[PDB]
Amino acid sequence: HAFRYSLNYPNIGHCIIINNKNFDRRTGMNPRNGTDVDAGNVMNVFRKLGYIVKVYNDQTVAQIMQVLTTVAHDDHSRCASLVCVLLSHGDEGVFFGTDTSVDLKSLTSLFRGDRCPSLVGKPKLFFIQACRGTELDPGVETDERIPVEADFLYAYSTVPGYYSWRNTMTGSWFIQSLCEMMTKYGSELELLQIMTRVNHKVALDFESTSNMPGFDAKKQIPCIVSMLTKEMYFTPSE
């Protein structure tokens, strides 16, 4: 059929980063210090690959809806793909604007095939750094028609139900691992191969340190959800 998504387009595509740091006091949510380190790394990595990167800082739900609805109604005929990086608080199934929460389904379904015709058949890649609940992982010691939901990737920082971890100096565990593995393998491996090595790095090299009771020595594994129908490479040749 065609084993890999085509890069035969003027632009590899757009990279939209929603980077939320400071939250409405009334929500009780804390600032996400170190998220600027995350967003800056992501920006340079996807700029190097040729994406047109745009960063939106401290966005409310309705501002996110607006930004993403404009991108979905834009024309992507000349783009090979779409990348969206989401950095915020969250809970199970939801993402936080600066003001309150919104269903992730509401963000991503804006790019469904029947609502975004210029991206039909093209990879729509979402990287989501946000909590998905409040559980902690204690770790364990060892020794043609197509479906409208097709061609999405949802690379979540953590398992459903669980907290996701962030360092205030180096940024979130998942995003600094993604940037390091993109930089090292972005021109040699395909995306799910890259994400498996993200998984390994987060799983093995990070463990929490905290004096807050119950929060010490915890682990994290990311959760890579693929509806992709082809291999995704970021360069024409390996």
């Binding site: 996400r32 915020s88 909590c131 971890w165 360092n167 205030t168 340190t209």
Partner: peptide
Amino acid sequence: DEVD
């Protein structure tokens, strides 16, 4: 280390 902080959770999100």
